[PDB]
Amino acid sequence: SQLAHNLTLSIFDPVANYRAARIICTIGPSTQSVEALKGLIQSGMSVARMNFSHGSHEYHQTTINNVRQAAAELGVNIAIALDTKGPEIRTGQFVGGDAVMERGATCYVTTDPAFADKGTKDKFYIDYQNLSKVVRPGNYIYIDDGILILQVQSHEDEQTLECTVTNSHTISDRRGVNLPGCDVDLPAVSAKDRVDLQFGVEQGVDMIFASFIRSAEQVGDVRKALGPKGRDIMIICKIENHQGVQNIDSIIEESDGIMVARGDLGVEIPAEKVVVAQKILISKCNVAGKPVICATQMLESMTYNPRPTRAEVSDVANAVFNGADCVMLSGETAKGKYPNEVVQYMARICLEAQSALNEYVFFNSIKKLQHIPMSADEAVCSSAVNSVYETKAKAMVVLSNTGRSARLVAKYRPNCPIVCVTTRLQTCRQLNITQGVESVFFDADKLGHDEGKEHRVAAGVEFAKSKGYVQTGDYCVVIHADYANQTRILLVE
Amino acid sequence: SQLAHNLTLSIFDPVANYRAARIICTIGPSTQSVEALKGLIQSGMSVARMNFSHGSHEYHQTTINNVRQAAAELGVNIAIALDTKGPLPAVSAKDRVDLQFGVEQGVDMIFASFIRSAEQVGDVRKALGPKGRDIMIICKIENHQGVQNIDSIIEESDGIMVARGDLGVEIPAEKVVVAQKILISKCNVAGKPVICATQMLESMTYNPRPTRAEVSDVANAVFNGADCVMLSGETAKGKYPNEVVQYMARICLEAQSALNEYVFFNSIKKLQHIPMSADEAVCSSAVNSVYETKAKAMVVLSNTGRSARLVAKYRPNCPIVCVTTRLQTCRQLNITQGVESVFFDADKLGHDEGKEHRVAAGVEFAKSKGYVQTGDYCVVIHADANQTRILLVE
Amino acid sequence: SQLAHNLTLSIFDPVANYRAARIICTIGPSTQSVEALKGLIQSGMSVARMNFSHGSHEYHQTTINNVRQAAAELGVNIAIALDTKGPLPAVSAKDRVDLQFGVEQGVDMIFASFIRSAEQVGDVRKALGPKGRDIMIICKIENHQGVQNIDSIIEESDGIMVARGDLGVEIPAEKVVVAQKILISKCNVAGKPVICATQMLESMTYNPRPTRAEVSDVANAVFNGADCVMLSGETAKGKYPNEVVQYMARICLEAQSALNEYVFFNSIKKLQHIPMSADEAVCSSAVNSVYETKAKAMVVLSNTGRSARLVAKYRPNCPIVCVTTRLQTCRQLNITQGVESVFFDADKLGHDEGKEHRVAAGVEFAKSKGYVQTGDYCVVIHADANQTRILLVE
Amino acid sequence: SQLAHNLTLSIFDPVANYRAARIICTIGPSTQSVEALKGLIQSGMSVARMNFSHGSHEYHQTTINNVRQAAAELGVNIAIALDTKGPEIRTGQFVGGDAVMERGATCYVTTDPAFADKGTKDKFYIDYQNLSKVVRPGNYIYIDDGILILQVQSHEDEQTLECTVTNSHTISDRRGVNLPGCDVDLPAVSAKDRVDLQFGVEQGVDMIFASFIRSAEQVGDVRKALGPKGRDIMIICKIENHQGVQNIDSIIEESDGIMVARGDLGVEIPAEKVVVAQKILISKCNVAGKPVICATQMLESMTYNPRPTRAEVSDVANAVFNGADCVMLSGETAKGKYPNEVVQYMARICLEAQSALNEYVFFNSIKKLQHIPMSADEAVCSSAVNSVYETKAKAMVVLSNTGRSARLVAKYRPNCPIVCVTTRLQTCRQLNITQGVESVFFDADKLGHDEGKEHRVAAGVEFAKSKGYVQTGDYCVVIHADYANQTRILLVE
Ligand SMILES: Cc1cc(C)c(S(=O)(=O)O)cc1Nc1ccc(Nc2c(C)cc(C)c(S(=O)(=O)O)c2C)c2c1C(=O)c1ccccc1C2=O
Ligand SMILES: Cc1cc(C)c(S(=O)(=O)O)cc1Nc1ccc(Nc2c(C)cc(C)c(S(=O)(=O)O)c2C)c2c1C(=O)c1ccccc1C2=O
Ligand SMILES: Cc1cc(C)c(S(=O)(=O)O)cc1Nc1ccc(Nc2c(C)cc(C)c(S(=O)(=O)O)c2C)c2c1C(=O)c1ccccc1C2=O
Ligand SMILES: Cc1cc(C)c(S(=O)(=O)O)cc1Nc1ccc(Nc2c(C)cc(C)c(S(=O)(=O)O)c2C)c2c1C(=O)c1ccccc1C2=O
Ligand SMILES: [K+]
Ligand SMILES: [K+]
Ligand SMILES: [K+]
Ligand SMILES: [K+]
Ligand SMILES: [K+]
Ligand SMILES: [K+]
Ligand SMILES: [K+]
Ligand SMILES: [K+]
């Protein structure tokens, strides 16, 4: 049926009148200013990502205010995402400043703090105390973004390892280190993470991109760290290693969403398997009805070039085909030369891919996996999307305050736009990581509570008409679920 | 049910015991020697491509002779492919002489460059003449015209090549991705081999390893349902000709582990019109039997290889073993995915009208490769006067 | 999946908590008195049939008056049906006067005798006039012409009666069985009530018990999917008027225990064309919801009863409760299977545009009959400006 | 889909060119002669049933020889069926000859043998020793074909019961008695049964209609009784009471087929439930792939009348609709006035019903109930019938010696005739209780073994052409299974 859909397609037929997939942009010096951010919003940005691995609270404070200003001036809602620093293993200091590692040379990595400030080419410090327990002779240690690769030969003692330098590379003070294949038992949240998350709650961020998640128990740690005030902030778990992939089922259940970080995964898992892992994680989230983000090596060559490679274009397209809600941009928007052109092009690719995509395969697949009997919530939303296909309805209107109904509806993948009408601006922002949904804020303060709902309903249809999704004579499937639910098949005037 | 299949998958489970996708290699300075060609075959080459845009007849004669020698010393059959220069007319004067050479040297298939319409395929057929009627024409789609007339082109030709790079010159890259989907799916329906070509693992021509984007490209080509993936510069002039073929084989095997063949089987079966003619019904039913009984191999008796291609069309989730009386067929089935050919010498072994000798040879091959053991089911199909056997392995 | 359903069944399991099929009784000397009519209602009568082939207006006036009194004293709604003499013209001079009487006395439905074509239904409509436009015409198929023109007849009429005895006069009995299958299935598709009539439990008119063949006849009529079964002599002039209605109710309930409503639901849904109009989509989806969530009752807000009939068409495996503002509808829905009507007095209780009062009345009725308790699901549907609610019962 | 099939039907379109259902006739004085039997064969009889409740070995010897003679003279194969007497509870003798039971009178049924020969209206004998154990006050005892109904009031002692006569009826010496609802523990086979079965084997009967089967263990008793010589004779279990219905699953598995005796069932189970029980037993046998016979009250009024009641006509038709292989005639052929006209009419009804029947519903239903993976036998036959629907094949040819493949193929219900080619005349006869199959005997003695099979295959196609099922240009699905199997889709010349 995806096969069958391909036969009817023509590459010369006009694209769809809406883009379902959502674009996340990492903010950096190339895009932090208000006018640069207004550029990105018009280019197709829905979520602004702050990378808390770099820059101070003052720096990310600027981002928060500029993102809020740029959004207000354009009268749109943009989500703010906090990407945590997470746990990190780093080397110590070197005398004096660096150390040049010759290929074939023997060196000693020690876990003893007495060498934290007197590292040399021959012996230097690594700050993770259990390093000796988790690493075995034959294993590899990556240092400085995986540029320096060295192989562990033997245990010199319970604190130091004998290594051989595979790579000629000069390393500086306090470089990050990777332990491919090893079971790292660092805390879920670091001491710095607790501070940054605290800040996130105080500044009212919409979501946390929680780094290096390995088990379900770690998701609770992030929740505890966010505290009672932050109980409504979405936790999106970043899967970065084998543990995260292995524990994916329990992690998905505890998280509000997932991020597939292909680059971090590519460190210790062969790239061919990372492609397959992507399919797995995206499909699992689709069934769960939780947002999924395809992140990392998207249009990276377009950081310095006006156009990407062809293989990169198919990578972005196939992310949509896999069923990803979101596609992410890192250095392309943060430090790149073409921050607007890369977001505009990613939008074009997502829309082109969507035109080829058969949403009915998604609907049918996700429907068949529901056990009988279904519960009310599941039944209503699945049936609503069913009605859309049944009647060739050209829009949907979902009344959801928290965004739960909207996410559940989007889960079943209609072939029409989903308009969500919410009384909460927080929900307008948070739904930006759910594909195929657009938010309309209904001001319950200066417009009333509207228990009759038909003000909120007409507000949704008004939005659908203005965007050109529906006209007179068209069908629109309206749904309000909360379990006080209802489904209306409406004729548009 | 690809979505349902993705859920059950684990990337830490062992890979499949066979690769279904096929690999085509472009021969060049880096790989023309007998020893280099033995390296390629062991790495996973099924088809040798000669690029006639460059080199003389004497140069490509070396390739033809070396490939046949490298193959003989390894006891395997390798397909030899002629890729015409092309341009404007379909066949040029240069092409007419080149195709003349191909017939005389007995090449297995033609990669016809820059094919834009259905009658242009006939010009290539005309140039081959009566002696080369058994040579396959694989049309290369390189422009908007080829994409537009694709329905008629597929009907006239024996297969398609999706040249993404050439199509990219004029069509925006994002649309070339979709065009790949269409071209491959149409070819699957027709039951004719489709080749994904150009810009495959290009960075690995001078680098020890390719980019991640390039890896996903190869994988998704297999996911789209391509019979073949093709290497151009990577084997012709590259620094790592053996490693790039071994890596592509690894990617194809990994992708195949993730691929749900049942979706392919079911999609193609549903598009068949009732009533089905004998050949379609026999073949779809036999593939169905495999799924029905969890059979671990198939045996197809096919002389011309028509039966083998039609069975392959329905995508079993087990290896297909084709027992053929012709070596020509053995080489030609190297562009059809999920098939492995076994030569049965009708000269020094007999005609075998009872067919039990040919069948026994197929089962023996499936046993020797470790596809089926005692107690396993194996669907046998002969359809020249057809028959279907579900055989229990002793 | 009726075959699959038969496997799971046990004849020692308790019967279903409701009967879906409806029973129509012919009033006669044996049953005209108020007390006899109360006996019939308690035994399972939903519809009273007056046979106008015999008796005077004064005689049938007694029936009309007695039925309404017997029904009032039991607080139930009973449908009054006029069965015309018939013959040749559709409506005769006698029929024109009889139908005149029916309108003036406000009968609920007409059983139009010997209907052969679609325009003949219009003659019955003509005879009813503007005052009787809300009276249902159920055409009686009694000959080969009626069977032949059945498609147009069903389209014009509000329902069908399969008169097996009358059809038997000319058509061989074995073909009348098949004709019953066709007529009933066509009516199910149209979503219009179908009545199985004549030769039902005929031996039980003078005998205390019927033959086994007669029992299977009644059961299979329910299996074919008839809304109603009808008693003629058995109640009009019989020795055991109460026992025969109680026994038919028992048979219908037993058959319904064996019947797989999902087969009916699925067969009718598949015959719908995509795209569906709102009404069809709303109703099929609501019945689907019941199966999807194992809901134990349905509530339909319907004034004219169009919604109730359309929901009933899709055959839920749970009771349907129709909340109507009109008593006319309550009586008229007595020929639609699986439906029970609740009267909502719009005069002394309000218009209820919010609909929550009408809905609460339906749930209350489903509670009082023991269909749903706390924790059970109940699909509510209003479709005059439509809406669908899956309500959890408190 | 049966619903959908009904819409396309027209009662004026010509009937099918073959009848699938099979007709069983009970032989009696009305049909025992050779010419009367030749009458029945031409009328549509496939199986001759002997009722061993009545008539001596000499009487049934006559039937066997006359049935064999009548079949030979017409060059057709007819099955001979032995319907066993089975266990029976009877009263004792009365002085002198009878006893008149007044309605409302009190009488005493005793199990004490001393009253076997001096029964009166007041006290008389019943020969079943455990009668006191199985019957409780309030229960009913039926005597003389259920004409005499009396209600047990109390236990007079451990040997006699106090009863009240509900029915005015005069009863004769040694009348049969029923115990509705009671768990009768009489032996599976009686002493007389063992003698009659012995005779059956010696005379080479094809099948046993084993009376009053209550459990699976009883089926083994009949098998043991039939002995090593009779190991190939089919055992068809007669379900006559609640126990048989309750144990149906295990009984079906041990038997070669089932008979639904609606009359015997109607004794203790209300008729409405007997209709439902019929649906259950027929569908269970269809899944099992074992023949099922609808027996008893078929066209009974046609025993004395030239035509049956309309309700009887729909009864016979609905037996076919239920999915019964066979319909049976008892007194209609044994003692009736119109033995030819009743078989001819039953044939007309079966053929008319079949014309309305959608075999594809049967195929699909039985296919969906097969678990994955299927075994070879199941896979081949299901797939063969699939090919028939797939190609609109107009015939099937099955090479089966025992008839196993033929039964398995027929199980899946093709919409075309099934021609079975067997080297065994025993199989030709036995397949007469399997619907939609016709047998061709291939003489392996005077025609060879034919390992190439294509002689047997061409013999089948020859038969299919002669009956007019296939002509030139038609498809025919050929199958040989044994697990040396094969499937050919053949073009007819
Ligand atoms: C300077 C250097 C030394 C080495 C050794 C290497 S290495 O050898 O390749 O690794 C690379 C670089 N290059 C840079 C380093 C820092 C830079 N700014 C920066 C950063 C990156 C982080 C933080 C935290 C802060 S701070 O917190 O505000 O102080 C600041 C100011 C920048 C650059 C650029 O090259 C650059 C080029 C064009 C435009 C802008 C920048 C740029 O901003
Ligand atoms: C402007 C520029 C141009 C060039 C060419 C280069 S060069 O190429 O390195 O020389 C560097 C820069 N400068 C930066 C580049 C990246 C930065 N963030 C960052 C980092 C360090 C790593 C990753 C992995 C990612 S991510 O993957 O995209 O999330 C991100 C966003 C930052 C800066 C800053 O200047 C800066 C100044 C003050 C505070 C914070 C930052 C800052 O955070
Ligand atoms: C005679 C009698 C007494 C009573 C009391 C009653 S009752 O009151 O209604 O029960 C009924 C009857 N009626 C019959 C009884 C026996 C009959 N033959 C017969 C039987 C039935 C079994 C056996 C074993 C043997 S034997 O083994 O060969 O001896 C024979 C000869 C017959 C009849 C007929 O009426 C009849 C009518 C027309 C044609 C043929 C017969 C007929 O053959
Ligand atoms: C010829 C006739 C006409 C009339 C009218 C009548 S009447 O109606 O009773 O008076 C009786 C008869 N005679 C018979 C009737 C039935 C018979 N078998 C039988 C029985 C006794 C019960 C049931 C239940 C069934 S069954 O259900 O059909 O299997 C059957 C076959 C038999 C006879 C014999 O004469 C006869 C003679 C010698 C040996 C054996 C029999 C014999 O077995
Ligand atoms: K980070
Ligand atoms: K689309
Ligand atoms: K070329
Ligand atoms: K696979
Ligand atoms: K009448
Ligand atoms: K039911
Ligand atoms: K018997
Ligand atoms: K038929």
CATH number, domain at C10?
Answer: 3.40.1380.20
Ligand 4: residues with CB < 6 A are D 26, 28-30, 51, 54-55, 59, 330-331, 334-335
Residues of chain A with Cβ-Cβ distance to B213 below 8 Å are 297, 309, 311-312, 314-315
Strands (E), D144-256: 148-155, 160-165, 169-172, 177-178, 207-210, 234-239
Query: Are 3 or more Cβ–Cβ pairs between A and B shorter than 8 Å?
Result: yes
d(CA D484, CA B315): 26
Concatenated DSSP letters for D383-450? HHHHHHHHHT--EEEEE-SSSHHHHHHHHT--SS-EEEEES-HHHHHHGGGSTTEEEEE--STTT---
Beta-carbon contacts of C4 under 8 Å, excluding residues fewer than 6 positions away, are: C260, D365, D368, D369
- Helix, strand, coil share (%) of chain C residues, nearest 5: 50, 20, 35
Same domain, D126 and D222: no
d(CA B200, CA B234): 9
What pairing do the DSSP bridges indicate for beta strands A177-178 and A140-143?
Answer: antiparallel
Catalytic annotation on A465? no
Question: Which of D389, D391, D415 to mutate to probe the B interface, most B CBs <10 Å?
Answer: D391
Same domain, A373 and A453: yes
Give how far Cα A387 sits from Cα of A370, A407, A410, A462, C288, Å: 17, 17, 14, 21, 11
d(CA A327, CA A259): 10
> Residues D225, D81: contact at Cβ < 8 Å?
no
Distance of CA B320 to the CA centre of its chain: 13
Ligand 2: residues with CB < 6 A are A 26, 28-30, 51, 54-55, 59, 330-331, 334-335
CB contact under 8 A, A9 and B178: yes
C278 touches chain A (CB under 8 A): yes
How far is the alpha carbon of C34 from chain D, nearest alpha carbon, in Å? 31
Strand partners, B112: B139
Concatenated DSSP letters for A33-53? SHHHHHHHHHHTEEEEEEETT
Question: Which domain CATH number covers A111?
Answer: 2.40.33.10
Residues followed by a gap in chain B, C→N > 2.5 Å = 87, 384
Query: Are 3 or more Cβ–Cβ pairs between B and C shorter than 8 Å?
Result: no
d(CA C168, CA C145): 13
Beta-carbon contacts of B11 under 8 Å, excluding residues fewer than 6 positions away, are: A245, A269, A273, A276, A277, A280
Give how far Cα A404 sits from Cα of A259, A410, A478, B237, C97, Å: 19, 10, 15, 56, 64
Beta-carbon contacts of B377 under 8 Å, excluding residues fewer than 6 positions away, are: B290, B293, B294, B295, B296, B390, B391, B392, B393, D376
What are the structure tokens assigned to D119, written together? 């029964």
What are the structure tokens assigned to C91, written together? 């409506």
Taking residue A113's Cβ as centre, other Cβ atoms within 10 Å add up to: 12
Query: Which contacts (CB < 8 Å, 24+ apart) does range A386-390 have?
Result: A386/C285, A386/C288, A387/A477, A387/A487, A387/A489, A387/C281, A387/C285, A388/A414, A388/A415, A388/A416, A388/A477, A389/A360, A389/A363, A389/A414, A389/A415, A390/C274, A390/C275, A390/C276, A390/C281, A390/C285
> Residues D163, D107: contact at Cβ < 8 Å?
yes
Q: What is the tally of helices (H) and strands (E) in chain D? A: 18, 21
Is D90 flagged in the annotation as binding?
A: yes
Same domain, D45 and D193: yes
Beta-carbon contacts of D150 under 8 Å, excluding residues fewer than 6 positions away, are: D101, D107, D109, D140, D141, D143, D163, D164, D165, D166, D167
> Residues D490, D478: contact at Cβ < 8 Å?
yes
How close are the terminal C-alpha atoms of chain D, in Å?
34
Q: What is the tally of helices (H) and strands (E) in chain A? A: 18, 21
Q: Closest-lying ligand to the alpha carbon of D238? A: 11
The two most distant CA atoms of chain D are separated, in Å, by: 81
Q: Which residues of C make up each annotated binding site?
A: 49, 51-54, 83-84, 142, 165-166, 198
- Helix, strand, coil share (%) of chain A residues, nearest 5: 40, 20, 40
d(CA C167, CA D286): 34
Question: Which of D1, D252, D265, D276 to mutate to probe the C interface, most C CBs <10 Å?
Answer: D276
Q: Judged by CB atoms within 8 Å, which residues 326-365 of D form the interface with C?
A: 348-349, 352-353, 355-356, 361-362, 365
Secondary structure of residue A124 in the 3-state scheme: strand
Work out the angle between the directed axes of helices D271-288 and C241-258 (0-180°, nearest 10).
20
> Residues C340, C319: contact at Cβ < 8 Å?
yes
Same domain, C228 and C370: no
Tell me if D54 CB under 6 Å of ligand 3.
yes
- The residue type of B238 is G
Q: Closest-lying ligand to the alpha carbon of A208? A: 5
Residue A97 CA, ligand 1 centroid: distance in Å: 17
Per-residue burial over C111-145, b = 16 or more CB atoms within 10 Å of its CB, e = otherwise? bbbbbbbbebbebbbebbeeebeebbbbbbbbbbe
> Residues C304, C355: contact at Cβ < 8 Å?
no
> Residues A189, A52: contact at Cβ < 8 Å?
no
Distance of CA A168 to the CA centre of its chain: 35
Query: How would you classify residue A342: left for phi > 0, otherwise alpha for psi between -120 and 50, otherwise beta?
Result: alpha
> Residues D475, D414: contact at Cβ < 8 Å?
no
A315 touches chain B (CB under 8 A): yes
> Residues A116, A100: contact at Cβ < 8 Å?
no
Question: Which domain CATH number covers B192?
Answer: 3.20.20.60
Same domain, B9 and B147: no
CB contact under 8 A, C392 and A483: yes
Secondary structure of residue C96 in the 3-state scheme: helix
Query: How would you classify residue D104: left for phi > 0, otherwise alpha for psi between -120 and 50, otherwise beta?
Result: left
Residue C53 CA, ligand 9 centroid: distance in Å: 5
Atom of ligand 4 nearest to the CA of D28: 31
In degrees rounded to 5, what are phi and psi of residue B45?
-75, 130
Question: For C224, which residue in chain D has the nearest alpha carbon?
Answer: D3
> Residues D446, D454: contact at Cβ < 8 Å?
no
Residue D309 CA, ligand 8 centroid: distance in Å: 62
Sign for the pseudo-dihedral over CA of B20, B26, B32, B36: negative
Beta-carbon contacts of D352 under 8 Å, excluding residues fewer than 6 positions away, are: C174, C175, C177, C178, D15, D317
Strand partners, C194: C160
In degrees rounded to 5, what are phi and psi of residue B275?
-80, 145
Strands (E), chain C: 22-26, 45-51, 79-83, 109-112, 136-141, 159-163, 194-197, 228-231, 297-301, 320-324, 339-343, 377-383, 386-392
Taking residue A471's Cβ as centre, other Cβ atoms within 10 Å add up to: 11
Concatenated DSSP letters for B60-108? HHHHHHHHHHHHHHTT---EEEEE------SS-HHHHHHHHHHHHTT-S
d(CA B155, CA D281): 54
How far is the alpha carbon of C140 from chain D, nearest alpha carbon, in Å? 18
Catalytic residue among A38, A90, A307, A465: A90
What are the structure tokens assigned to D120, written together? 């009166």
Same domain, B12 and B76: no
> Residues D215, D221: contact at Cβ < 8 Å?
no
Same domain, A148 and A214: no
d(CA A336, CA A346): 14
Catalytic residue among A22, A49, A175, A407: A49
Beta-carbon contacts of B385 under 8 Å, excluding residues fewer than 6 positions away, are: none
> Residues A456, A464: contact at Cβ < 8 Å?
no
Residue D28 CA, ligand 3 centroid: distance in Å: 12
Alpha helices (runs of H) in chain B, residue ranges in sequence order = 2-8, 34-43, 57-73, 93-104, 118-128, 144-148, 150-156, 164-168, 173-190, 212-224, 233-236, 241-258, 261-270, 278-293, 306-313, 327-332, 346-349, 356-368
Concatenated DSSP letters for D297-348? SSSGGGGTSSS--HHHHHHHHHHHHHT-SEEEESHHHHT-S-HHHHHHHHHH
Secondary structure of residue A193 in the 3-state scheme: helix
Check whether the bond before B55 is cis (ω within 30° of 0).
no
Same domain, D299 and D373: no
In degrees rounded to 5, what are phi and psi of residue A387?
-60, -35
The residue to which tokens 């096929």 are assigned: B22
What are the structure tokens assigned to A361, written together? 């395969």
d(CA A238, CA A241): 9
> Residues A333, A81: contact at Cβ < 8 Å?
no
Catalytic annotation on A404? no
Nearest to C387 among A391, A487, A491 (CB): A487
Residue in C64, C18, C83, C13 with CA at minimum distance from that of residue C44: C18
Residues of chain C with Cβ-Cβ distance to D356 below 8 Å are 178, 181
Of the three residues A135, A161, A187, the one that is the final residue of a domain is: A187
Sign for the pseudo-dihedral over CA of D147, D148, D153, D154: negative
What range defines the domain where residue B155 resides? 20-86+90-255
In the 8-state DSSP scheme, what is residue A450?
-
How far is the alpha carbon of D124 from chain C, nearest alpha carbon, in Å? 30
CB contact under 8 A, C164 and D310: yes
Q: Which residues of A make up each annotated binding site for ATP?
A: 51-54, 90
In the 8-state DSSP scheme, what is residue C130?
G
Distance of CA C99 to the CA centre of its chain: 21
Of the three residues D289, D318, D353, the one that is the final residue of a domain is: D353
Residue A326 CA, ligand 1 centroid: distance in Å: 29
Burial label for B90, CB within 10 Å (0-12, 13-18, 19+), is buried
Same domain, D442 and D409: yes
Same domain, B198 and B270: no
Edge-to-edge strand order for the sheet containing A140-143?
A123-125, A106-110, A160-165, A148-155, A140-143, A177-178
Element (H, E) at A328: strand A326-329
CB-hemisphere CA count at 13 Å for C19?
Answer: 26
Q: Whose CA is nearest to atom 40 of ligand 2?
A: A55
d(CA B246, CA A30): 41
d(CA D431, CA D401): 11
In degrees rounded to 5, what are phi and psi of residue A203?
-90, -5
Of the three residues C255, C284, C300, the one that is the final residue of a domain is: C255
What pairing do the DSSP bridges indicate for beta strands C386-392 and B297-301?
Answer: unpaired
Give how far Cα C265 sits from Cα of C256, C262, C292, C293, Å: 15, 5, 13, 15
d(CA B92, CA C30): 101
How many interchain CB pairs under 8 A, C with D?
150
CB-hemisphere CA count at 13 Å for D91?
Answer: 29
Residues of chain D with Cβ-Cβ distance to C212 below 8 Å are 262-263, 266, 271, 274, 297, 315
Same domain, B98 and B235: yes
A473 touches chain C (CB under 8 A): no
Atom of ligand 3 nearest to the CA of D56: 27
Taking residue D84's Cβ as centre, other Cβ atoms within 10 Å add up to: 25
Domain count, chain C: 2
Q: Closest-lying ligand to the alpha carbon of D171? A: 3
Same domain, B5 and B46: no
Is D456 flagged in the annotation as binding?
A: no
The residue to which tokens 């602004």 are assigned: A48
Burial label for B273, CB within 10 Å (0-12, 13-18, 19+), is exposed
Residue in C254, C218, C259 with CA at minimum distance from that of residue D270: C254
